[PDB]
Design an enzyme around this catalytic site. Structure first.
Site, PDB file in Angstrom:
ATOM      1  N   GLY A 201       0.812  -1.234   0.000  1.00  0.00           N
ATOM      2  CA  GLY A 201       0.000   0.000   0.000  1.00  0.00           C
ATOM      3  C   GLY A 201       0.838   1.274   0.000  1.00  0.00           C
TER       4      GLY A 201
ATOM      5  N   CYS B  39       3.597   1.786  -2.069  1.00  0.00           N
ATOM      6  CA  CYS B  39       4.299   1.970  -3.368  1.00  0.00           C
ATOM      7  C   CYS B  39       3.800   3.260  -4.009  1.00  0.00           C
ATOM      8  CB  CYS B  39       4.179   0.749  -4.261  1.00  0.00           C
ATOM      9  SG  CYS B  39       5.137  -0.612  -3.553  1.00  0.00           S
TER      10      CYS B  39
END
Ligand SMILES: Nc1ccc(-c2ncno2)cc1
Length: 182
Positions: free
Chosen positions: A146, A148
């Site tokens: 979550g 990135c």
């Protein structure tokens, strides 16, 4: 809480959108005009969702170095009716190590998230999900799924975007001024 978080917040508030592809929701950094960046593993297509609005992709380029090694940055030009604040003067010109960095994330899962990750090493080569990757920055924080696309900043500089982790360390792809010359 301090001047690091102040710079990070100023970038998040004006220069980020929520990008959705078929591979998930990502923090997306807008750099100038309609040009933004995202990790290459987002697999950007002809259509992307920007803050939940259907948006045509005018151009998408997966960057590689002059050894033809993955850099894990995709530059996207968006068919958007509005330009980003130009932040190219905050991009480093050369590969470097940094002190006292912040990783900032804004998604549906993680709204208004700021992480003081500390010292950032010029790590260089990383086998990232089995893909040989260059120009990797490393920080000793246990980053999760979550995060990135998350923006890595120091005071006065936007230095990278989060592209992976091993449970104890996080890894960012460098942003360099020379990627965004026009
Ligand atoms: N990188 C991290 C670490 C912890 C959390 C969290 N814990 C509880 N709720 O959120 C989120 C992201």
């Amino acid at each position: 809480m301090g001047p690091g978080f102040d710079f990070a917040q100023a970038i998040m508030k004006k220069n980020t959108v929520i990008a959705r592809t078929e591979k998930g929701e990502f923090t997306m950094l807008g750099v100038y005009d309609r040009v933004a960046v995202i990790p290459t593993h987002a697999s950007v297509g002809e259509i992307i969702y920007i803050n939940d609005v259907e948006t045509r992709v005018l151009d998408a380029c997966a960057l590689r170095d002059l050894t033809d090694t993955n850099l894990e940055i995709t530059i996207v030009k968006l068919d958007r009716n509005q330009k980003f604040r130009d932040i190219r003067h905050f991009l480093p010109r050369c590969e470097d190590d940094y002190n006292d960095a912040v990783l900032s994330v804004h998604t549906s899962k993680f709204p208004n998230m700021y992480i003081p990750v500390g010292q950032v090493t010029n790590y260089g080569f990383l086998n990232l999900g089995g893909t040989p990757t260059h120009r990797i920055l490393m920080y000793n924080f246990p980053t999760r799924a979550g995060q990135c696309g998350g923006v890595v900043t120091t005071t006065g500089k936007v230095i990278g975007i989060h592209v992976g982790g091993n449970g104890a360390q996080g890894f960012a792809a460098m942003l360099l001024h020379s990627y965004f010359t026009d």
